[PDB]
Write an enzyme that holds these catalytic residues in place. Structure first.
Site, PDB file in Angstrom:
ATOM      1  N   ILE A 175      40.180  60.637  39.238  1.00  0.00           N
ATOM      2  CA  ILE A 175      40.669  61.528  40.286  1.00  0.00           C
ATOM      3  C   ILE A 175      39.581  62.538  40.750  1.00  0.00           C
ATOM      4  O   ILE A 175      38.948  63.158  39.932  1.00  0.00           O
ATOM      5  CB  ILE A 175      41.890  62.325  39.736  1.00  0.00           C
ATOM      6  CG1 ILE A 175      43.085  61.394  39.481  1.00  0.00           C
ATOM      7  CG2 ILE A 175      42.305  63.422  40.732  1.00  0.00           C
ATOM      8  CD1 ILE A 175      44.178  61.988  38.622  1.00  0.00           C
ATOM      9  N   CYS A 176      39.318  62.673  42.032  1.00  0.00           N
ATOM     10  CA  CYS A 176      38.489  63.824  42.483  1.00  0.00           C
ATOM     11  C   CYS A 176      39.432  64.940  42.985  1.00  0.00           C
ATOM     12  O   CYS A 176      40.181  64.708  43.932  1.00  0.00           O
ATOM     13  CB  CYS A 176      37.553  63.434  43.607  1.00  0.00           C
ATOM     14  SG  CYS A 176      36.373  64.727  43.991  1.00  0.00           S
TER      15      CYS A 176
END
Lengths: 77, 154
Positions: free
Chosen positions: B90-91
């Site tokens: 996840i960013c």
């Protein structure tokens, strides 16, 4: 009024002035407040049986210098 | 820390009792007896290609929590510029340099749900997917929609 010692597993002994005909609600919340944890996160015993919010020292036969044992709850509240 | 385990327990119940849970938008399950691993689930937000879908999230509490963030990954594969299409990595700022020690499991879950409804393609996790979002929105939607059916029960 009556002095009561609250003892945790660390073996700390914290002293309270408590009215004879008044809910132990206050003691229990004041302790949790002192220690910075939510109420319902700790349970309190006298003679191996849990205090309740409605309980008072009037009932339970609670005396001067009597001890209450506090433990953490599994849920943690 | 037992401070960290008591905390996680409290925040687990906070999610249990939440409105978002009673509306079935978010939920959390317990994985380990020790509260070091959780499993989150978020619904696909409406009016997105994830809508109808449910996304599981692996949540791991490192030893330096709460001074470092939970390690969060999508278990459910998803087509999103800020999530790895291969790994579910996840960013998202609050999982990195904008983590704050007072943020709760609920906060995290809601942020991820808002993540699903709101991409930042100029800071991608999956540059292929992010390039497609930017250069070919319509193929991006059709693909995100098919991934949501295939992988997310949509």
């Amino acid at each position: 009024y009556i002095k009561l010692k609250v003892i945790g597993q660390d073996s700390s002994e914290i002293h309270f002035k408590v009215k004879m005909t008044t809910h132990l609600k206050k003691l229990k919340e004041s302790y949790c407040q002192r220690q910075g944890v939510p109420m319902n996160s700790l349970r309190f015993l006298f003679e191996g049986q849990r205090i309740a919010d409605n309980h008072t020292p009037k009932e339970l036969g609670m005396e001067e210098e009597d001890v209450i044992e506090v433990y953490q709850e599994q849920t943690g509240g | 820390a037992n401070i960290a385990v008591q905390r996680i327990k409290r925040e687990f119940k906070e999610v249990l009792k939440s409105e978002e849970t009673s509306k079935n938008q978010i939920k959390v399950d317990l994985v380990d007896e020790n509260f070091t691993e959780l499993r989150g689930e978020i619904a696909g937000p409406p009016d997105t290609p994830y809508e109808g879908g449910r996304y599981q999230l692996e949540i791991k509490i490192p030893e330096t929590y709460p001074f470092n963030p939970p390690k969060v990954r999508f278990i459910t594969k998803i087509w999103h510029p800020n999530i790895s299409s291969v790994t579910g990595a996840i960013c998202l700022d609050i999982l990195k340099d904008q983590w704050a020690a007072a943020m709760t499991l609920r906060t995290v879950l809601l942020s991820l749900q808002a993540l699903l409804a709101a991409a930042e393609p100029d800071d991608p996790q999956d540059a292929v997917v992010a390039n497609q979002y930017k250069q070919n929105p319509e193929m991006f939607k059709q693909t995100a929609r098919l991934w949501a059916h295939v992988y997310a029960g949509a």
